[PDB]
Amino acid sequence: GPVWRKHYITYRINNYTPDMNREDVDYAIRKAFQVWSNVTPLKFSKINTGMADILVVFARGAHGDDHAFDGKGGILAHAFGPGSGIGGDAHFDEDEFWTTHSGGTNLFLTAVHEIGHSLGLGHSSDPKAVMFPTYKYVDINTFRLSADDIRGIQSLYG
Ligand SMILES: [Ca+2]
Ligand SMILES: [Ca+2]
Ligand SMILES: [Ca+2]
Ligand SMILES: [Zn+2]
Ligand SMILES: [Zn+2]
C-alpha cells in the first residue's frame, strides 16, 4: 500500500482528551512515534500550527470522516494510511478513557498501533504484535515491538 516518500514526518495534536494531563498526551504520542523511528529512517516532529502529515485527533461518534466511533469499548481508534489530507491521520475515540497506565485504554500503546497504520502497516495475525487488531495492555515501560512488527515496518521503510 501507500508509504511516506520522505523521512521527515510531522504530526500535530489537533485537540487533547480531557482524560489525561496535557503533558502526558504529548509524551505518550511522542513516545509512540519514537517506537517507529527507532526501527526506520523516519524522523517525527511535533508541530503546533499548520498542516502536519499526521493529525492526531480525539473525537467521538460521527466525526467527519466516514468512520464513526462506537462509544466506549469496541473500536478504540483508527488511522489512515499515508496520503494527502486525511491520509496519515490518527483518530482516538474520546468515548474511551485514555490513560498513561494499565487502567482505561493506554494511549501510548494504542498510538503505537495507530501510527503503524499512519505509516502504512496493516494488521498482524500474531497476538504478540502491536499491530494485532486486539488491544492488550503490556507494561509500557518495558514495551518492545514484536519481530513481526519490525519485519512489517521494515518491509515498508529502510
Ligand atoms: Ca494527514
Ligand atoms: Ca469505542
Ligand atoms: Ca474519554
Ligand atoms: Zn476518524
Ligand atoms: Zn488497527
Which domains occur in the chain, in start order? 1-158 (3.40.390.10)
Say what angle helices 147-154 and 107-118 make with each other, to 10 degrees.
Answer: 30
What is the Cα–Cα distance from 112 to 119, expressed in whole angstroms?
Answer: 11
- Do strands 54-59 and 90-93 pair parallel, antiparallel, or not at all (unpaired)? parallel
Tell me which residues have their CB within 5 A of the ion that is ligand 4.
65, 67, 91
Which of 32, 77, 114, 124 is flagged as catalytic?
Answer: 114
The experimental technique behind this entry is X-ray
Ligand 2 centroid distance, CA of 106 (Å): 13
What is the Cα–Cα distance from 70 to 34, expressed in whole angstroms?
Answer: 29
- Of 115, 126, 128, whose CA–CA distance to 156 is shortest? 115
What is the Cα–Cα distance from 98 to 92, expressed in whole angstroms?
Answer: 9
Radius of gyration of the chain, Cα coordinates, nearest whole angstrom: 14
The burial class, CB within 10 Å (0-12 / 13-18 / 19+), for 147 is: exposed
Ligand 2 centroid distance, CA of 3 (Å): 27
Q: Is 23 a catalytic residue?
A: no
Ligand 4 centroid distance, CA of 83 (Å): 15
Question: Which residue, chain included where needed, has cell 521503510?
Answer: 157
Resolution of the experimental structure, in angstroms: 1.0
In the DSSP assignment, the letter for residue 141 is G
